[PDB]
Amino acid sequence: MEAIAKHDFSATADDELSFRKGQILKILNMEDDSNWYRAELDGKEGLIPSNYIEMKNHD
């Protein structure tokens, strides 16, 4: 349910979000299990590129 940005990301679509390396993005919906994901940042929802993040949660 928690993830961290391994790199920088800028939305490539209207329904997308953005994030920077080291930040903690909240997962809410991963879609249909493919290339675009959905998280919450600063109380905002939007999709993200799956290849730019990595499942976190804890050690």
Coordinates of all heavy atoms in Angstrom, one line a residue:
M1 N 0.8 -1.2 0.0 CA 0.0 0.0 0.0 C 0.9 1.3 0.0 O 0.4 2.4 -0.2 CB -0.9 0.0 1.2 CG -2.0 -1.1 1.2 SD -2.5 -1.6 2.9 CE -0.9 -2.0 3.6
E2 N 2.2 1.1 0.2 CA 3.1 2.2 0.2 C 4.2 2.0 -0.8 O 4.7 0.9 -0.9 CB 3.7 2.5 1.6 CG 2.9 3.4 2.5 CD 3.0 3.0 4.0 OE1 2.4 2.0 4.4 OE2 3.8 3.7 4.7
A3 N 4.7 3.0 -1.4 CA 5.8 2.9 -2.4 C 6.7 4.1 -2.4 O 6.3 5.2 -1.9 CB 5.2 2.7 -3.8
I4 N 7.8 3.9 -3.0 CA 8.8 5.0 -3.0 C 9.4 5.1 -4.5 O 9.6 4.2 -5.2 CB 10.0 4.7 -2.1 CG1 11.0 5.9 -2.0 CG2 10.8 3.4 -2.5 CD1 12.0 5.9 -3.1
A5 N 9.5 6.4 -4.9 CA 10.0 6.7 -6.2 C 11.5 6.4 -6.4 O 12.3 7.0 -5.7 CB 9.7 8.2 -6.5
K6 N 11.8 5.6 -7.3 CA 13.2 5.3 -7.6 C 13.8 6.3 -8.6 O 15.1 6.5 -8.7 CB 13.4 3.9 -8.2 CG 14.3 3.0 -7.4 CD 15.8 3.1 -7.8 CE 16.6 4.0 -6.8 NZ 18.0 3.5 -6.7
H7 N 13.0 7.1 -9.2 CA 13.4 8.1 -10.1 C 12.3 9.2 -10.2 O 11.3 9.2 -9.5 CB 13.6 7.5 -11.5 CG 14.7 6.5 -11.5 ND1 16.0 6.7 -11.3 CD2 14.6 5.1 -11.7 CE1 16.7 5.6 -11.3 NE2 15.8 4.6 -11.6
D8 N 12.6 10.2 -11.1 CA 11.7 11.4 -11.2 C 10.6 11.1 -12.3 O 10.9 10.3 -13.2 CB 12.6 12.6 -11.7 CG 11.7 13.7 -12.2 OD1 10.7 14.1 -11.6 OD2 12.0 14.2 -13.3
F9 N 9.4 11.6 -12.0 CA 8.4 11.3 -13.0 C 7.4 12.5 -13.3 O 6.8 13.0 -12.4 CB 7.5 10.1 -12.5 CG 6.1 10.2 -13.0 CD1 5.8 10.2 -14.4 CD2 5.0 10.2 -12.1 CE1 4.5 10.2 -14.8 CE2 3.7 10.3 -12.6 CZ 3.5 10.2 -13.9
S10 N 7.2 12.7 -14.5 CA 6.3 13.7 -15.0 C 5.2 13.1 -15.9 O 5.5 12.3 -16.7 CB 7.0 14.8 -15.7 OG 8.4 14.4 -15.9
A11 N 3.9 13.4 -15.6 CA 2.8 12.9 -16.3 C 2.9 13.0 -17.8 O 3.3 14.0 -18.3 CB 1.5 13.5 -15.8
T12 N 2.5 11.9 -18.4 CA 2.5 11.8 -19.9 C 1.1 11.8 -20.4 O 0.8 11.7 -21.6 CB 3.4 10.6 -20.3 OG1 4.7 10.9 -20.1 CG2 3.2 10.2 -21.8
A13 N 0.1 12.0 -19.5 CA -1.3 12.1 -19.9 C -2.0 13.0 -18.9 O -1.5 13.4 -17.9 CB -1.9 10.7 -19.8
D14 N -3.3 13.4 -19.3 CA -4.1 14.3 -18.5 C -4.5 13.7 -17.2 O -4.7 14.5 -16.2 CB -5.3 14.7 -19.3 CG -5.7 16.1 -19.2 OD1 -6.0 16.6 -18.1 OD2 -5.6 16.8 -20.3
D15 N -4.7 12.4 -17.1 CA -5.1 11.8 -15.9 C -4.0 11.2 -15.1 O -4.2 10.2 -14.3 CB -6.1 10.6 -16.3 CG -7.5 10.9 -15.9 OD1 -8.0 11.9 -16.3 OD2 -8.1 10.0 -15.3
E16 N -2.8 11.8 -15.2 CA -1.6 11.3 -14.6 C -1.1 12.3 -13.5 O -1.5 13.4 -13.5 CB -0.6 11.1 -15.7 CG 0.7 10.4 -15.2 CD 1.4 9.6 -16.3 OE1 1.2 9.9 -17.5 OE2 2.2 8.7 -15.9
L17 N -0.2 11.8 -12.7 CA 0.4 12.6 -11.6 C 1.9 12.8 -11.8 O 2.4 12.6 -12.9 CB 0.1 12.0 -10.2 CG -1.2 12.5 -9.5 CD1 -1.3 11.9 -8.1 CD2 -1.2 14.0 -9.4
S18 N 2.6 13.1 -10.8 CA 4.1 13.3 -10.9 C 4.7 13.1 -9.5 O 4.1 13.3 -8.4 CB 4.4 14.7 -11.4 OG 3.3 15.3 -12.0
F19 N 6.0 12.7 -9.5 CA 6.7 12.5 -8.2 C 8.3 12.5 -8.4 O 8.8 12.3 -9.5 CB 6.3 11.2 -7.5 CG 6.4 10.0 -8.4 CD1 7.7 9.5 -8.8 CD2 5.3 9.3 -8.9 CE1 7.9 8.4 -9.6 CE2 5.5 8.2 -9.7 CZ 6.8 7.8 -10.0
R20 N 9.0 12.6 -7.3 CA 10.5 12.7 -7.3 C 11.1 11.5 -6.5 O 10.5 11.0 -5.6 CB 10.9 14.0 -6.8 CG 11.9 14.7 -7.6 CD 12.5 16.0 -6.9 NE 13.7 15.6 -6.2 CZ 14.4 16.5 -5.4 NH1 13.9 17.7 -5.2 NH2 15.5 16.1 -4.8
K21 N 12.3 11.2 -6.9 CA 13.1 10.1 -6.3 C 13.2 10.4 -4.8 O 13.5 11.4 -4.3 CB 14.5 10.0 -6.9 CG 15.6 10.2 -6.0 CD 16.0 11.7 -6.0 CE 17.5 11.9 -5.6 NZ 18.3 12.4 -6.8
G22 N 12.9 9.3 -4.0 CA 13.0 9.4 -2.5 C 11.6 9.7 -1.9 O 11.5 9.5 -0.6
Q23 N 10.6 10.1 -2.6 CA 9.3 10.4 -2.0 C 8.4 9.2 -1.8 O 8.7 8.2 -2.4 CB 8.5 11.4 -2.9 CG 7.6 12.4 -2.2 CD 8.4 13.5 -1.5 OE1 8.9 14.4 -2.2 NE2 8.6 13.4 -0.2
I24 N 7.5 9.4 -0.9 CA 6.6 8.3 -0.6 C 5.2 8.5 -1.1 O 4.4 9.3 -0.6 CB 6.5 8.0 0.9 CG1 7.9 7.7 1.5 CG2 5.6 6.8 1.2 CD1 8.0 7.6 3.0
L25 N 4.8 7.8 -2.2 CA 3.5 7.9 -2.8 C 2.6 6.8 -2.3 O 3.0 5.7 -2.0 CB 3.7 7.7 -4.3 CG 4.5 6.5 -4.8 CD1 3.7 5.4 -5.4 CD2 5.7 6.9 -5.7
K26 N 1.3 7.2 -2.1 CA 0.3 6.2 -1.6 C -0.4 5.5 -2.7 O -1.1 6.2 -3.5 CB -0.6 7.0 -0.7 CG -1.5 6.2 0.2 CD -1.2 6.5 1.7 CE -2.0 7.7 2.2 NZ -1.5 9.0 1.7
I27 N -0.4 4.2 -2.6 CA -1.1 3.4 -3.6 C -2.5 3.2 -3.2 O -2.9 2.9 -2.1 CB -0.5 2.0 -3.8 CG1 1.0 2.1 -3.5 CG2 -0.7 1.5 -5.2 CD1 1.7 3.1 -4.4
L28 N -3.4 3.4 -4.2 CA -4.8 3.2 -4.0 C -5.4 2.3 -5.0 O -6.2 1.4 -4.7 CB -5.6 4.6 -4.0 CG -4.9 5.7 -3.3 CD1 -4.5 6.8 -4.3 CD2 -5.8 6.3 -2.2
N29 N -4.9 2.4 -6.2 CA -5.4 1.6 -7.3 C -4.3 1.5 -8.4 O -3.8 2.4 -8.9 CB -6.7 2.2 -7.9 CG -6.9 1.8 -9.4 OD1 -7.0 0.6 -9.7 ND2 -7.1 2.8 -10.2
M30 N -4.0 0.2 -8.7 CA -2.9 -0.1 -9.7 C -3.5 -0.3 -11.1 O -2.8 -0.7 -12.0 CB -2.2 -1.4 -9.3 CG -3.0 -2.6 -9.1 SD -2.7 -3.5 -7.5 CE -1.0 -4.0 -7.8
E31 N -4.8 0.0 -11.2 CA -5.5 -0.2 -12.5 C -5.8 -1.6 -12.8 O -6.4 -2.3 -11.9 CB -4.6 0.4 -13.6 CG -5.4 0.7 -14.9 CD -5.6 2.2 -15.2 OE1 -5.9 3.0 -14.2 OE2 -5.3 2.6 -16.3
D32 N -5.5 -2.1 -14.0 CA -5.7 -3.5 -14.4 C -4.5 -4.3 -14.3 O -4.5 -5.5 -14.8 CB -6.5 -3.6 -15.7 CG -8.0 -3.4 -15.6 OD1 -8.4 -2.4 -15.0 OD2 -8.7 -4.2 -16.0
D33 N -3.4 -3.8 -13.7 CA -2.2 -4.5 -13.6 C -1.4 -4.4 -14.9 O -1.3 -5.4 -15.6 CB -2.4 -6.0 -13.2 CG -1.8 -6.4 -11.9 OD1 -0.6 -6.2 -11.8 OD2 -2.5 -7.0 -11.1
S34 N -0.9 -3.2 -15.1 CA -0.1 -3.0 -16.3 C 0.9 -1.9 -16.1 O 1.6 -1.8 -15.1 CB -1.1 -2.7 -17.5 OG -1.2 -3.7 -18.4
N35 N 1.1 -1.0 -17.2 CA 2.2 0.0 -17.2 C 1.8 1.3 -16.4 O 2.7 2.0 -16.0 CB 2.5 0.3 -18.6 CG 3.7 -0.6 -19.2 OD1 3.5 -1.8 -19.2 ND2 4.8 0.1 -19.6
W36 N 0.5 1.6 -16.3 CA 0.1 2.8 -15.6 C -0.5 2.4 -14.2 O -1.4 1.6 -14.2 CB -0.8 3.6 -16.4 CG -0.3 4.0 -17.7 CD1 -0.7 3.7 -19.0 CD2 0.9 4.8 -17.9 NE1 0.1 4.3 -19.9 CE2 1.1 5.0 -19.3 CE3 1.8 5.5 -17.1 CZ2 2.2 5.7 -19.9 CZ3 2.9 6.2 -17.6 CH2 3.0 6.3 -19.0
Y37 N -0.1 3.1 -13.2 CA -0.6 2.9 -11.8 C -1.3 4.1 -11.3 O -1.3 5.2 -11.9 CB 0.6 2.6 -10.9 CG 1.0 1.2 -10.7 CD1 2.1 0.8 -10.0 CD2 0.2 0.1 -11.3 CE1 2.5 -0.5 -9.8 CE2 0.6 -1.2 -11.1 CZ 1.7 -1.5 -10.4 OH 2.1 -2.8 -10.2
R38 N -1.9 4.0 -10.1 CA -2.7 5.2 -9.5 C -2.3 5.4 -8.1 O -2.5 4.5 -7.2 CB -4.2 5.0 -9.7 CG -4.9 6.3 -9.9 CD -6.1 6.2 -10.8 NE -6.5 7.5 -11.3 CZ -7.8 7.7 -11.7 NH1 -8.7 6.8 -11.6 NH2 -8.1 9.0 -12.1
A39 N -1.8 6.6 -7.7 CA -1.5 6.9 -6.3 C -2.0 8.2 -5.9 O -2.6 9.0 -6.7 CB 0.0 6.8 -6.1
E40 N -1.8 8.6 -4.6 CA -2.2 9.8 -4.0 C -1.0 10.6 -3.4 O -0.2 10.0 -2.7 CB -3.2 9.6 -2.8 CG -4.1 10.8 -2.5 CD -4.2 11.0 -1.0 OE1 -3.1 11.2 -0.3 OE2 -5.3 10.9 -0.4
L41 N -0.9 11.8 -3.8 CA 0.2 12.7 -3.3 C -0.3 14.1 -3.1 O -1.1 14.6 -3.9 CB 1.3 12.7 -4.4 CG 2.7 13.0 -3.8 CD1 2.7 13.5 -2.4 CD2 3.6 11.7 -3.9
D42 N 0.0 14.6 -1.9 CA -0.5 15.9 -1.5 C -2.0 16.0 -1.6 O -2.6 17.0 -1.9 CB 0.1 17.0 -2.4 CG 1.6 17.0 -2.3 OD1 2.1 17.5 -1.3 OD2 2.2 16.6 -3.3
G43 N -2.7 14.9 -1.2 CA -4.2 14.9 -1.2 C -4.7 14.9 -2.6 O -5.9 15.3 -2.8
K44 N -3.9 14.5 -3.6 CA -4.3 14.5 -5.0 C -4.1 13.1 -5.6 O -3.1 12.4 -5.3 CB -3.4 15.5 -5.8 CG -4.0 16.8 -6.1 CD -4.5 17.5 -4.8 CE -5.5 18.6 -5.1 NZ -5.1 19.5 -6.2
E45 N -5.1 12.7 -6.4 CA -5.0 11.4 -7.1 C -4.6 11.6 -8.6 O -4.8 12.6 -9.2 CB -6.3 10.7 -7.0 CG -6.3 9.2 -7.5 CD -6.6 8.2 -6.5 OE1 -7.2 8.6 -5.4 OE2 -6.3 7.0 -6.7
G46 N -4.0 10.5 -9.1 CA -3.5 10.5 -10.5 C -2.6 9.3 -10.7 O -1.9 8.8 -9.9
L47 N -2.6 9.0 -12.0 CA -1.8 7.8 -12.5 C -0.3 8.1 -12.5 O 0.2 9.3 -12.5 CB -2.3 7.4 -13.8 CG -1.5 7.9 -15.0 CD1 -0.4 7.0 -15.5 CD2 -2.5 8.2 -16.2
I48 N 0.5 7.0 -12.5 CA 2.0 7.1 -12.5 C 2.6 6.0 -13.3 O 1.9 4.9 -13.5 CB 2.5 7.0 -11.1 CG1 2.0 5.8 -10.3 CG2 2.2 8.3 -10.3 CD1 2.8 5.3 -9.2
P49 N 3.8 6.2 -13.9 CA 4.4 5.1 -14.7 C 5.0 4.1 -13.8 O 5.9 4.3 -13.0 CB 5.5 5.9 -15.5 CG 5.9 7.0 -14.6 CD 4.7 7.3 -13.7
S50 N 4.5 2.9 -13.9 CA 4.9 1.7 -13.0 C 6.4 1.4 -12.9 O 6.9 1.1 -11.8 CB 4.1 0.5 -13.5 OG 3.4 -0.1 -12.4
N51 N 7.1 1.7 -14.0 CA 8.5 1.4 -14.1 C 9.3 2.5 -13.2 O 10.5 2.2 -13.0 CB 9.0 1.5 -15.5 CG 10.0 0.4 -15.8 OD1 10.6 -0.2 -14.9 ND2 10.2 0.2 -17.1
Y52 N 8.7 3.6 -12.8 CA 9.4 4.6 -12.1 C 9.2 4.4 -10.5 O 9.7 5.3 -9.8 CB 8.9 6.0 -12.5 CG 9.8 6.7 -13.5 CD1 9.3 7.6 -14.4 CD2 11.2 6.5 -13.4 CE1 10.1 8.2 -15.3 CE2 12.0 7.2 -14.3 CZ 11.5 8.0 -15.2 OH 12.3 8.7 -16.1
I53 N 8.6 3.4 -10.1 CA 8.4 3.2 -8.6 C 8.7 1.8 -8.2 O 8.9 0.9 -9.0 CB 7.0 3.6 -8.2 CG1 6.0 2.6 -8.7 CG2 6.7 5.0 -8.6 CD1 5.3 1.7 -7.7
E54 N 8.7 1.6 -6.9 CA 9.0 0.2 -6.3 C 8.3 0.0 -5.0 O 8.3 0.9 -4.1 CB 10.5 0.0 -6.1 CG 11.1 0.7 -4.9 CD 12.2 1.8 -5.3 OE1 11.8 2.7 -6.1 OE2 13.3 1.7 -4.9
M55 N 7.6 -1.1 -4.9 CA 6.8 -1.4 -3.7 C 7.7 -1.3 -2.5 O 8.8 -1.8 -2.4 CB 6.3 -2.9 -3.8 CG 4.9 -3.0 -3.1 SD 3.7 -3.8 -4.2 CE 4.4 -5.4 -4.4
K56 N 7.1 -0.5 -1.5 CA 7.8 -0.3 -0.3 C 7.0 -0.9 0.9 O 7.2 -2.1 1.2 CB 8.0 1.2 -0.1 CG 8.8 1.6 1.1 CD 9.0 3.1 1.2 CE 10.5 3.5 1.3 NZ 11.1 3.0 2.5
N57 N 6.3 -0.1 1.7 CA 5.6 -0.6 2.8 C 6.4 -0.7 4.1 O 6.2 -0.1 5.1 CB 4.9 -1.9 2.6 CG 3.9 -1.8 1.4 OD1 3.9 -0.9 0.6 ND2 3.0 -2.8 1.4
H58 N 7.5 -1.5 4.0 CA 8.4 -1.7 5.1 C 9.5 -2.7 4.7 O 9.5 -3.3 3.6 CB 7.7 -2.1 6.3 CG 8.0 -1.3 7.5 ND1 7.1 -1.1 8.6 CD2 9.1 -0.5 7.8 CE1 7.7 -0.3 9.5 NE2 8.9 0.1 9.0
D59 N 10.4 -2.9 5.6 CA 11.5 -3.9 5.4 C 11.1 -5.3 5.7 O 11.3 -6.1 4.8 CB 12.7 -3.5 6.4 CG 13.9 -3.0 5.6 OD1 14.4 -3.7 4.7 OD2 14.4 -1.9 5.9

